[PDB]
Amino acid sequence: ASGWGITGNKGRCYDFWMDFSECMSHCREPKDCTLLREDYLECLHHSKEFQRRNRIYKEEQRKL
């Protein structure tokens, strides 16, 4: 969220954080910014990407 990257460039997830912040800056219902918020968290932790790839791995293991 700070934008300072550990190698001297813009942080990896900073643009997602900003877009989330601009959204929340004028949407009175926080549910209006859900998609951008989960995009920022997905950039942080890669949870859904890894879950889907683990699904692919599971199906491959099942069919082997």
Residues that bind another protein (CB under 8 A): 1-2, 4-9, 11-13, 17, 20-21, 24, 29-31, 33-34, 37, 44-47, 50-51, 53-54, 56-57, 60
Token pair belonging to 50: 């890894």
Please state the separation of Cα 48 from the chain's center in Å: 9
CB of 59 to another protein, least distance (A): 11
The nearest distance, CB 6 to another protein, in angstroms, is 6
Q: Coil, strand, or helix at residue 23? A: helix
Report the distance separating Cα 17 and Cα 53, nearest Å.
25
* Minimum distance from residue 37 beta carbon to another protein (Å): 7
